[PDB]
Amino acid sequence: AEIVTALPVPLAPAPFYLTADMFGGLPVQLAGGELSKLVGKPVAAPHVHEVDELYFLVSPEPGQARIEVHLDGVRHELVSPAVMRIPAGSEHCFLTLEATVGSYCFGILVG
Protein backbone atom coordinates (compact mmCIF):
# COMPACT_ATOMS: atom_id res chain seq x y z
CA ALA A 1 0.00 0.00 0.00
CA GLU A 2 1.50 3.38 -0.97
CA ILE A 3 0.93 5.90 1.76
CA VAL A 4 2.84 9.18 2.13
CA THR A 5 2.70 10.66 5.66
CA ALA A 6 5.72 12.96 5.79
CA LEU A 7 3.64 16.00 4.81
CA PRO A 8 3.54 18.77 3.85
CA VAL A 9 6.88 19.20 2.09
CA PRO A 10 8.24 22.82 1.93
CA LEU A 11 9.13 23.93 -1.63
CA ALA A 12 10.44 27.37 -2.53
CA PRO A 13 8.54 28.26 0.85
CA ALA A 14 5.04 26.74 0.31
CA PRO A 15 3.58 23.55 1.97
CA PHE A 16 3.05 20.78 -0.62
CA TYR A 17 0.81 17.78 -0.07
CA LEU A 18 1.18 16.48 -3.64
CA THR A 19 4.43 16.83 -5.58
CA ALA A 20 5.05 15.84 -9.20
CA ASP A 21 7.43 13.04 -8.21
CA MET A 22 5.07 11.17 -5.84
CA PHE A 23 3.96 7.61 -6.66
CA GLY A 24 5.92 7.38 -9.89
CA GLY A 25 4.94 10.86 -11.16
CA LEU A 26 1.82 13.06 -10.95
CA PRO A 27 0.34 15.49 -13.52
CA VAL A 28 -0.40 18.01 -10.71
CA GLN A 29 1.22 19.46 -7.66
CA LEU A 30 -0.91 20.65 -4.74
CA ALA A 31 0.00 23.14 -2.05
CA GLY A 32 -1.87 25.12 0.44
CA GLY A 33 -3.18 25.37 3.89
CA GLU A 34 -5.63 26.32 6.56
CA LEU A 35 -6.84 29.90 6.17
CA SER A 36 -7.98 30.95 9.67
CA LYS A 37 -4.33 31.58 10.60
CA LEU A 38 -3.91 33.77 7.47
CA VAL A 39 -6.81 36.18 8.04
CA GLY A 40 -4.16 38.25 9.88
CA LYS A 41 -1.58 38.69 7.04
CA PRO A 42 -1.89 42.35 5.67
CA VAL A 43 0.12 41.75 2.44
CA ALA A 44 0.83 39.13 -0.19
CA ALA A 45 3.61 38.88 -2.81
CA PRO A 46 2.65 38.62 -6.55
CA HIS A 47 4.34 35.76 -8.42
CA VAL A 48 4.19 33.80 -11.65
CA HIS A 49 4.36 30.12 -12.58
CA GLU A 50 5.29 28.50 -15.89
CA VAL A 51 2.21 26.23 -15.63
CA ASP A 52 -1.43 27.03 -14.92
CA GLU A 53 -2.46 27.15 -11.27
CA LEU A 54 -5.99 26.45 -9.99
CA TYR A 55 -6.99 28.09 -6.74
CA PHE A 56 -9.41 25.93 -4.82
CA LEU A 57 -11.19 27.66 -1.90
CA VAL A 58 -13.30 25.53 0.43
CA SER A 59 -14.84 25.80 3.93
CA PRO A 60 -16.95 23.47 6.15
CA GLU A 61 -20.02 25.43 5.09
CA PRO A 62 -20.41 27.47 1.89
CA GLY A 63 -19.69 31.13 2.37
CA GLN A 64 -17.46 30.87 5.46
CA ALA A 65 -14.24 31.83 3.66
CA ARG A 66 -13.48 34.84 1.47
CA ILE A 67 -10.31 35.74 -0.40
CA GLU A 68 -9.18 38.45 -2.80
CA VAL A 69 -7.23 37.23 -5.82
CA HIS A 70 -5.06 39.89 -7.43
CA LEU A 71 -4.58 38.85 -11.05
CA ASP A 72 -2.68 41.09 -13.48
CA GLY A 73 -3.83 44.30 -11.72
CA VAL A 74 -7.46 43.12 -11.27
CA ARG A 75 -8.82 42.45 -7.77
CA HIS A 76 -11.32 39.53 -7.58
CA GLU A 77 -13.26 38.65 -4.49
CA LEU A 78 -14.22 34.99 -4.11
CA VAL A 79 -16.40 33.22 -1.57
CA SER A 80 -16.12 29.48 -0.78
CA PRO A 81 -16.57 27.21 -2.57
CA ALA A 82 -14.68 28.50 -5.62
CA VAL A 83 -12.12 27.39 -8.19
CA MET A 84 -10.15 29.88 -10.26
CA ARG A 85 -7.68 29.23 -13.09
CA ILE A 86 -4.50 31.34 -13.14
CA PRO A 87 -2.93 31.02 -16.67
CA ALA A 88 0.83 30.34 -16.79
CA GLY A 89 2.70 33.60 -17.10
CA SER A 90 0.06 35.58 -15.10
CA GLU A 91 1.14 37.63 -12.12
CA HIS A 92 -1.02 36.78 -9.12
CA CYS A 93 -1.46 36.16 -5.37
CA PHE A 94 -4.34 36.11 -2.92
CA LEU A 95 -5.18 37.59 0.48
CA THR A 96 -7.54 36.03 2.99
CA LEU A 97 -10.34 38.41 4.07
CA GLU A 98 -12.44 36.00 6.16
CA ALA A 99 -12.11 32.34 7.27
CA THR A 100 -13.56 29.96 9.86
CA VAL A 101 -11.29 27.26 11.35
CA GLY A 102 -10.94 24.53 8.70
CA SER A 103 -11.26 26.78 5.61
CA TYR A 104 -8.56 26.01 3.03
CA CYS A 105 -7.11 27.48 -0.09
CA PHE A 106 -5.15 25.04 -2.20
CA GLY A 107 -3.00 25.95 -5.17
CA ILE A 108 -3.00 23.21 -7.80
CA LEU A 109 -0.27 23.43 -10.46
CA VAL A 110 -1.45 21.67 -13.61
CA GLY A 111 1.37 19.99 -15.55
76 is in an annotated binding site: no
Contact 65, 41 (CB under 8 A): no
Is the four-CA dihedral 31, 36, 37, 42 of positive or negative sign?
Answer: positive
Q: Which of 43, 73, 74, 75 binds ligand I3A (CB under 6 A)?
A: 43
Contact 46, 95 (CB under 8 A): no
Q: Is 30 in the site for Fe ion (CB under 5 A)?
A: no
Q: Is 105 in the site for ligand I3A (CB under 6 A)?
A: yes
Q: Is 81 in the site for ligand I3A (CB under 6 A)?
A: no
Q: Which C-beta is closer to a copy of itself: that of 44 or that of 76?
A: 76
Q: Is 76 in the site for a copy of itself (CB under 8 A)?
A: yes
